[PDB]
Amino acid sequence: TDSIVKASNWRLVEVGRVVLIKKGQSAGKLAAIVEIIDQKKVLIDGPKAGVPRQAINLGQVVLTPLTFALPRGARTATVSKKWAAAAVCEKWAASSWAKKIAQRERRAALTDFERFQVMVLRKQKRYTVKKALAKA
Amino acid sequence: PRSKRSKLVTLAQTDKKGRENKERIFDEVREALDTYRYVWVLHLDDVRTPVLQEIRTSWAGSKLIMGKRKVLQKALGEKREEEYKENLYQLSKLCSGVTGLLFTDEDVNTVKEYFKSYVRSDYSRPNTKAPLTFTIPEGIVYSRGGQIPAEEDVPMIHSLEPTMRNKFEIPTKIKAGKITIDSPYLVCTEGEKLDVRQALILKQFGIAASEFKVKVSAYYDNDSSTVESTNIN
Amino acid sequence: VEPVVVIDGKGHLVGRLASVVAKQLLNGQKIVVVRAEELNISGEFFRNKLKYHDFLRKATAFNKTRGPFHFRAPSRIFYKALRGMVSHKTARGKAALERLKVFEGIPPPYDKKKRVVVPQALRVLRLKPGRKYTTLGKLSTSVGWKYEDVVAKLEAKRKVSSAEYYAKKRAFTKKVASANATAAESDVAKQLAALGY
Amino acid sequence: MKYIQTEQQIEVPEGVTVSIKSRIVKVVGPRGTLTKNLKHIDVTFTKVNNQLIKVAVHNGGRKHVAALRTVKSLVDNMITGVTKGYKYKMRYVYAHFPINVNIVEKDGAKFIEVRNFLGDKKIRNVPVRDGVTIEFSTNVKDEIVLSGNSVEDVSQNAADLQQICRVRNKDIRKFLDGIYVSHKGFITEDL
Amino acid sequence: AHFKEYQVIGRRLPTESVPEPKLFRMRIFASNEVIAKSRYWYFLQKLHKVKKASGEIVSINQINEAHPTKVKNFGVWVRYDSRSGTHNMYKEIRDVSRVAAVETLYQDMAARHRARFRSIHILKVAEIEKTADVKRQYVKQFLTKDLKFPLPHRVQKSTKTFSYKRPSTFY
RNA sequence: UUUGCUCCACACAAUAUAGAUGGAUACGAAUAAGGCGUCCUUGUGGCGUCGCUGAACCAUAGCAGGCUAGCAACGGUGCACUUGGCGGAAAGGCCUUGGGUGCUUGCUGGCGAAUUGCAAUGUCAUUUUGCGUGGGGAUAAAUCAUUUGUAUACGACUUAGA
RNA sequence: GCAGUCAAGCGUUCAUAGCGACAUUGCUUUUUGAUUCUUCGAUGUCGGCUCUUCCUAUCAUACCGAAGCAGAAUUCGGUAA
RNA sequence: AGAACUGGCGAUGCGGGAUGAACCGAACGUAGAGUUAAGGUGCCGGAAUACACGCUCAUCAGACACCACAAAAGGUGUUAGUUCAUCUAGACAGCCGGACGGUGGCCAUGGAAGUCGGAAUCCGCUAAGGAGUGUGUAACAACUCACCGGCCGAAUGAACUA
RNA sequence: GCCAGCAUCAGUUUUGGUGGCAGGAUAAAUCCAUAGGAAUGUAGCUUGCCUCGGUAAGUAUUAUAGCCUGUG
Ligand SMILES: [Mg+2]
Ligand SMILES: [Mg+2]
Ligand SMILES: [Mg+2]
Ligand SMILES: [Mg+2]
Ligand SMILES: [Mg+2]
Ligand SMILES: [Mg+2]
Ligand SMILES: [Mg+2]
Ligand SMILES: [Mg+2]
Ligand SMILES: [Mg+2]
Ligand SMILES: [Mg+2]
Ligand SMILES: [Mg+2]
Ligand SMILES: [Mg+2]
């Protein structure tokens, strides 16, 4: 006999939220929020990926579901130390989003002979899959 | 133009007093404590100007201050490391109501036994309980409302029926020439929580069942620099 | 890329949809639009009804049978916007308009096919939240269309049938996924994973 | 100015439960169950503990912020209805022709019949809404009591019962007849 | 445009009975040096009796921001010409650079008062050093402890002109 | 009416054609919310996972895809027949039963291909018949002319008669 | 229209250089409802018959609001062709 | 109805202003390639359903010079400013209590006690309270307001600019 | 004779990749060093508190996080 209100869960822009940059010179790389300028603009810094300290619109990035402890306005050596201490690159690599990104670029880098090999192995797997189905 | 509430129109003679009155009251309280030796903190809560212009007349020798409570506590310096005397912080933190400061010099048992006497009657005691149960009869209502004689009263005026019904929830009609409620309705009763509606009804029927009496919290002598507590309710 | 593209008109804005359908038709792609009674127009219902009455007022004064013809179906309101956005007096525009079909509801044979959307004409992506919008079935019913309950009954029947179909296909997808995940952690599965598939 | 965050707060008492999924509120209490469809506001509800709901708007303008307090008042009126109820009382007055008001069942639908209003031959019929109960209060002359859980249904039924008998083409400083609401309160008037 | 900040130092022409004339310095927000020197002579002709052919430019330098990555609060005093008269205004802008605050102010004046570039004078730009010296509530509502907010109703652009599922505005 | 008709088959002659060149690949509702999996009392439930585009998924090796020899499996699939159901919004299509028979690149071997000469769309899917030959079956009406007047400028309309 | 008193904005912060909205009085009596048999009329290229549409700036009919609106009968407004 | 200076049309096509003697760009042999002017880039229609910061919702919105005309004034529509004030000695809104005494001040009135009118406008006690801001009664009463106090606890009010 | 394909060049033009230098506050920054400071106040300590240490308010300039300013 308890009340039940579900309705939502949101990613928050706040200091410590890590961020994938979707367009610009530093596309595809991660940074962190270090300061909030207005409703539409923030200050970001990612030292390990190699993106400089800069102000941007929130429309040029996308928030990830990753965050870590960081004080407000912390400089670049501080965000490097706290980034490597909280270890967010390994959690990002273990995410299913980054595996799809790497799967996309791995499929893009293939050659003609590797496409032929992919086709042969797909047929060999399809044989045992369809045979293991319908006799289960 | 933006949607905002505009204030009501009133063009009268009085003007609004400012911080100068509070400053003059603070200076008067400090100078009165410096001049009179018998500063008594009292709590005159529910009182009519007629009764005070009487006590101010009986103790026509001493001084009475009835300013704002926080301003009076600031004048007596209710901070724990501030004072205008020796250890007046107890008499300063004693004030917790619509406080009054009776600064006298004369006595210390007389000024605490006469007060125990002055205790005239008052209105219907909207917060406390009432005693005299009144029920108006099933006839034409009158001004004293079953508190005067048969033909020695005046019937109630026609211009109060709307306030009697739509502001006190008492069933009424007119039906001939006067108020003339159909049934007999009991307003209040003995030893019960008198409500605001019951107190306003007893005031409009002009009954006086409660008594007003002064309640003195404490009294400090500046010669000995000491405050004696009392509970003269 | 498809020979025929079928578009579900539910939740689209009328002119933003008509612009992209007109360009696709002139470029040479066959379009079928279904559920034309579920389209939207930005603005209040009363304002859109007054605009339609301003259109209804125009007619040839010496013979009303010669004038502008006011068609009342929601598919015909959509067709009027599209015909305004092509140049229909020439043979090129006539052939482009003959590459198109518009219906209310989803009749056969399009109820067993795949329906797409146009994201730059969608109302939840284009309108600011808090603005008012009009629904085309209600507007056409108020101006004189007379088949709003028949279409609702037929659409209820179609929804019952497609819910049965989806229950069956979802159970099949579940057993195929369970049969596929048990052949992973195999050698050819690891070789396929290294090649990226 | 487009304020960043605005919140209102709803305090829910002991014996009542509330369930909000997609802006559809259900309140279940000791007197029944009320429901409401708030899917035109764009707010967010959040349960703090089992006694506090908090409703919020993020990045809202002035016209959008002005609807948080109406959402809070609507849900509080639902709670107050399901735990106390709403009781309206209506009194009807006449000068010459006594008004006869009765409860009837025309094909099982519970109407109020008003007849002989100002000597008319016409019968006025007003339907009882679903959930409101009509009683005729003894020991008071010419009074009706309307009771329910929904303040909107109870007030709307009292309003159309008021409006069905209005004075037409006469002088209303002279012709003082009809039905009027005299008290809006609660079924459980205290405690 | 995207502005820069210049110092312009100018002077009269030295002559008989006035040798070594006094130097005067200004800070001009402008997009190139030609517009910078033109604005210098505009202001110097309004304030003194010097012409462009009566004086000469001594020095033109560009000033960079000392700490370009540090979010500051700026108070800007401006005056402008409306359709009726001319007025003074004070505004507040939270940003990382003076040229950035000046760009946002020019956009704000164009959006809110329909004032063009030719009818705006930047009287002063300054940094407000302490909080509780911030007058504007739209700036004050970002100086709160542990500030957090979401971004509801995410809209994503796309390609390909057709989608095969209904979109989702979750975030 | 000099063999005229219906339905089903091709010897041969053809018609490209607002424009084939692996596949139009089926829930519904919401968007300040959902999809999928699991658990239990079955909910406006508990737990887990996903999204950030179809850049997907299925298909795809062989003379424009030939001729053959084996292994391993009980699968996949084409082609006509067959058992049942379902579909009326414009159903004109969807699912299924049980046998025949072809292929199989799931794995391993043996032959063949050239000269279209250093490119030329380098012709490969889909249709309605025609000359009568080929197999059963089906034997009609309308108009003019004559007539009526419920009709009528004339046509038309409405009646009667082998 | 003329003449005078004002007084918010004003002469892009001056009140009385010089404006000056809203007001306010004066001037136009056969000046105690009196006289005035008067249509003191206008109109020269249009008028009449027949017939059809449109506007709303609403006379009537429909529904409302205000009024010392008792009833009855009116007056002043709103929507409405 | 007439003059002065320059540029045009007449005598002149071409790109743009949908359309036009005179506007904007630019003046012309027949062709090819490249780049632009003025004007544009949702579709008609060649070219960003570009990027960025704001404002606006109109029951005849508004959309590009010549050119297809309208302010002061009114708006409890919204946005941004300017100058005055009040405020932890507790501001604004709300609830509750006080709102006194000479005195029913002086004339007029059949009667008008603060409230039909003319005069008037003082004094005391106050923390504050009008010879009264409205409702009211034949006149009185009663209520409200102006002004003070208790409770609650953060910024609020006026005039003006565009 | 008709129609084409490729290579090496010349004239005109359009669209990519990459290398060496110069200037300015001989970029301003970041980073390193050093003095001073504060709060949208970190550790520490003290309190109506105390859900049995959760939170609330008061001291405290780096400590069991940091930041700002100057100089190098
Ligand atoms: Mg009208
Ligand atoms: Mg009448
Ligand atoms: Mg008509
Ligand atoms: Mg000529
Ligand atoms: Mg010429
Ligand atoms: Mg020319
Ligand atoms: Mg032209
Ligand atoms: Mg034009
Ligand atoms: Mg040429
Ligand atoms: Mg185009
Ligand atoms: Mg070359
Ligand atoms: Mg350097």
Swiss-Prot record, chain A:
One of its GO terms (molecular function) is structural constituent of ribosome. It is found in: Cytoplasm. It holds the Pfam family KOW. Transmembrane segments: none annotated. It comes from the Eukaryota. GO terms for cellular component: cytosol; cytosolic large ribosomal subunit; nucleolus. One of its GO terms (biological process) is ribosomal large subunit biogenesis. InterPro entries: KOW (IPR005824), Rib_uL2_dom2 (IPR014722), Ribosomal_eL14 (IPR039660), Ribosomal_eL14_dom (IPR002784), Translation_prot_SH3-like_sf (IPR008991). The keyword tRNA-binding does not apply. The keyword S-adenosyl-L-methionine does not apply. Keywords: Acetylation, Cytoplasm, Ribonucleoprotein, Ribosomal protein. N-terminally acetylated by acetyltransferase NatA. Present with 45300 molecules/cell in log phase SD medium. Belongs to the eukaryotic ribosomal protein eL14 family. Component of the large ribosomal subunit (LSU). Mature yeast ribosomes consist of a small (40S) and a large (60S) subunit. The 40S small subunit contains 1 molecule of ribosomal RNA (18S rRNA) and 33 different proteins (encoded by 57 genes). The large 60S subunit contains 3 rRNA molecules (25S, 5.8S and 5S rRNA) and 46 different proteins (encoded by 81 genes). PANTHER family: 60S RIBOSOMAL PROTEIN L14, LARGE RIBOSOMAL SUBUNIT PROTEIN EL14. This is Large ribosomal subunit protein eL14A. It comes from Saccharomyces cerevisiae (strain ATCC 204508 / S288c). The gene is RPL14A.
From Swiss-Prot, chain B:
Present with 18200 molecules/cell in log phase SD medium. The gene is MRT4. One of its GO terms (molecular function) is large ribosomal subunit rRNA binding. GO terms for cellular component: cytoplasm; nucleolus; nucleoplasm; nucleus; preribosome, large subunit precursor; small-subunit processome. The lineage of its organism: Eukaryota, Fungi, Dikarya, Ascomycota, Saccharomycotina. Belongs to the universal ribosomal protein uL10 family. The keyword Cytoplasm applies. GO terms for biological process: maturation of SSU-rRNA; nuclear-transcribed mRNA catabolic process; ribosomal large subunit assembly; ribosomal large subunit biogenesis; ribosomal large subunit export from nucleus; rRNA processing. It comes from the Eukaryota. This is Ribosome assembly factor MRT4. Gene3D superfamilies: 3.30.70.1730, 3.90.105.20. Associates with the pre-60S ribosomal particle. PANTHER family: MRNA TURNOVER PROTEIN 4 HOMOLOG (PTHR45841:SF1), MRNA TURNOVER PROTEIN 4 MRTO4 (PTHR45841). Keywords: Cytoplasm, Nucleus, Ribosome biogenesis. It is found in: Nucleus, Nucleolus; Cytoplasm.
From Swiss-Prot, chain C:
Pfam families: Ribosomal_L13 (PF00572). N-terminally acetylated by acetyltransferase NatA. Belongs to the universal ribosomal protein uL13 family. Component of the ribosome, a large ribonucleoprotein complex responsible for the synthesis of proteins in the cell. The small ribosomal subunit (SSU) binds messenger RNAs (mRNAs) and translates the encoded message by selecting cognate aminoacyl-transfer RNA (tRNA) molecules. The large subunit (LSU) contains the ribosomal catalytic site termed the peptidyl transferase center (PTC), which catalyzes the formation of peptide bonds, thereby polymerizing the amino acids delivered by tRNAs into a polypeptide chain. It comes from Saccharomyces cerevisiae (strain ATCC 204508 / S288c) (Baker's yeast). The gene is RPL16A. It comes from the Eukaryota. Present with 43300 molecules/cell in log phase SD medium. Keywords: Acetylation, Cytoplasm, Isopeptide bond, Ribonucleoprotein, Ribosomal protein, Ubl conjugation. It is found in: Cytoplasm. The keyword Transmembrane does not apply. The keyword Acetylation applies. This is Large ribosomal subunit protein uL13A. There is a cross-link at residue 175 (Glycyl lysine isopeptide (Lys-Gly) (interchain with G-Cter in ubiquitin)). One of its GO terms (molecular function) is structural constituent of ribosome. GO terms for biological process: cytoplasmic translation; maturation of LSU-rRNA; negative regulation of translation. One of its GO terms (cellular component) is ribosome.
From Swiss-Prot, chain E:
Keywords: Cytoplasm, Isopeptide bond, Phosphoprotein, Ribonucleoprotein, Ribosomal protein, Ubl conjugation. The keyword tRNA processing does not apply. It holds the Pfam family Ribosomal_L18A. There is a cross-link at residues 124, 130, 148 (Glycyl lysine isopeptide (Lys-Gly) (interchain with G-Cter in ubiquitin)). GO terms for cellular component: cytosol; cytosolic large ribosomal subunit. Component of the large ribosomal subunit (LSU). Mature yeast ribosomes consist of a small (40S) and a large (60S) subunit. The 40S small subunit contains 1 molecule of ribosomal RNA (18S rRNA) and 33 different proteins (encoded by 57 genes). The large 60S subunit contains 3 rRNA molecules (25S, 5.8S and 5S rRNA) and 46 different proteins (encoded by 81 genes). eL20 forms multiple interactions with RNA and proteins in the central protuberance, connecting components of core functional centers that are located far apart. This is Large ribosomal subunit protein eL20A. It comes from Saccharomyces cerevisiae (strain ATCC 204508 / S288c).
